[PDB]
C-alpha cells in the first residue's frame, strides 16, 4: 500500500496536544537541552552526540519511528558505546540523565503531534511545483527546525512558530534541485 496511506494512517491516529500541554512540552525540551550542556561538560566535550543517543533511546518506543526528512543515524554499535559511557556516573549525574531523557521525550511527542499539521500545509501545495509525499519530506524538516529553535520565554505560540518554518521549508524547497 502506497505510504500515502501507510504513513497517513499512522499519524491519523496521533492526537493533537492542548495549548498548554504543548507549551509545557516545548519547555521540557529546553530543560532537557540545558541538562545536555551539563551531561556534556563532564563526560567530555560538547552535546550533540549525547542528544542523538538519548533520542535513539527514546525513539525505541516511539509510536512513529519513520519520519521523512530526518537523517536517522542509528549506528547499531554507537548505542551501547555511549549508553554505557553515561549510565555509570556520579549520584548527581543520574538525575540529569533523567531530565535529558524527558526533555527529549518531549521533543518527540511535540513532533508527532504536529505531523498531521505538516500534512495539511503540504496539501495546500498540491498540483503545483512538487508533489504530496515530496513536500512532506520538507515540511517535516521545518517542523524539526522549529522544535529546535523554539523559545517559550520569548512569548510566541508553538502552533504558529511551527507553521512559520514548515511553510518556509517548503517555499525554500520549491526552488527545486
Amino acid at each position, epitope marked *: 500500500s502506497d505510504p500515502v496511506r501507510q504513513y497517513l494512517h499512522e499519524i491519523g491516529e496521533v*492526537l*493533537e*496536544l*492542548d*495549548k*498548554w*500541554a504543548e*507549551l*509545557g512540552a516545548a519547555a521540557k525540551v529546553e530543560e532537557g537541552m540545558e541538562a545536555i550542556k551539563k551531561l556534556s561538560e563532564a563526560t567530555g566535550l560538547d552535546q550533540e552526540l549525547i542528544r542523538e543517543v538519548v533520542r535513539a533511546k527514546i525513539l525505541g518506543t516511539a509510536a512513529i519511528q519513520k519520519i521523512p526528512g530526518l537523517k536517522e543515524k542509528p549506528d547499531p554499535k554507537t548505542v551501547e558505546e555511549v549508553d554505557g559511557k553515561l549510565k555509570s556516573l556520579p549520584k548527581e549525574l543520574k538525575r540529569y540523565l533523567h531530565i535529558a531523557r524527558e526533555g527529549e521525550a518531549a521533543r518527540q511527542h511535540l513532533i508527532e503531534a504536529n505531523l498531521r499539521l505538516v500534512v495539511s500545509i503540504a496539501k495546500k501545495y498540491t498540483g503545483r511545483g512538487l508533489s504530496f509525499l515530496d513536500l512532506i519530506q520538507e515540511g517535516n524538516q521545518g517542523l524539526i527546525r522549529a522544535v529546535e529553535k523554539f523559545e*517559550y*520565554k520569548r*512569548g510566541f*505560540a508553538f*502552533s*504558529t512558530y511551527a507553521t512559520w518554518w514548515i511553510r518556509q521549508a517548503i517555499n525554500r524547497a520549491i526552488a527545486d534541485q
Partner: antibody
Amino acid sequence: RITLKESGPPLVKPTQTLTLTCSFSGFSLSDFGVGVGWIRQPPGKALEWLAIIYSDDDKRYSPSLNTRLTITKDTSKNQVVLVMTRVSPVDTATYFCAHRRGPTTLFGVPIARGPVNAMDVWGQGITVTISS
Amino acid sequence: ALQLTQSPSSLSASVGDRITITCRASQGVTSALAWYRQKPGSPPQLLIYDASSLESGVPSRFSGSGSGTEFTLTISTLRPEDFATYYCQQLHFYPHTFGGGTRVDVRR
C-alpha cells in the same frame, strides 16, 4: 463575577446555517491565555465538545465536524460567535458556552498552568432544534 | 480517539454515604482532568480542576485523585443536593473529550 449567555435561533431548518453568540462579562478575551469554548448536549445524552478560541486567536474544532464549524471573537464587544453550516436534526441539542482560565503567569511567562485544566464557568445554555 | 470511560454509569446511596466515581482514560492525560456536576435542567458546574484541586466555592465534601490514566471523584458525606449526573473531562489533547456520565440516585 463571570457571566456567559448564549443567544440564537430556537429552531433552524435542515441544511441551513446555525449562528450562536456567546455574550459575557467578568472577564475579557484580551486576558492572558483565556479561552472561550462551546459544548453541546443532545437530548438524553452526554456532553460533547465542539470548539474553543483563545485570546491570541488560536482556535480548535472537534474533528467529527470541523468542516462545518467556524468560531470567531469580538474582544471589544465581549462576544464569541460559533457558526455551523449544513445542519441536520442530529445537531438538535442544548448549546453551552464556557470560560477557560488562562495560566497564572509571572506577568508574561507562564508558571502555574494548573487552573487552565477545567472549564470553570458555564452559560445557562440555549436549546436549539433543527427540524422542518 | 482518546476515550474516557466512566464507572459506574449509575448508582444509589443514602444521605451520609461515601462514594467513588472513576474515570479511565484511553491514554495518559497527566493531571489535566476536570470533574463537573450537572443537576437536571442546569449547566454543568466545576468541582475539581487539574485532577485534584477543589474549585473555590465548592463544598469540601468533594475531592479528586489520580494521574495519567486512572482518576476518581469522592463525596465524603452524600447530601440531599448531591444527586445528579457527574461528568469528567480531559484537556490534555484536542479535542477535549467528556466522559459518558454517572447518575447518582438516593435510596429509600
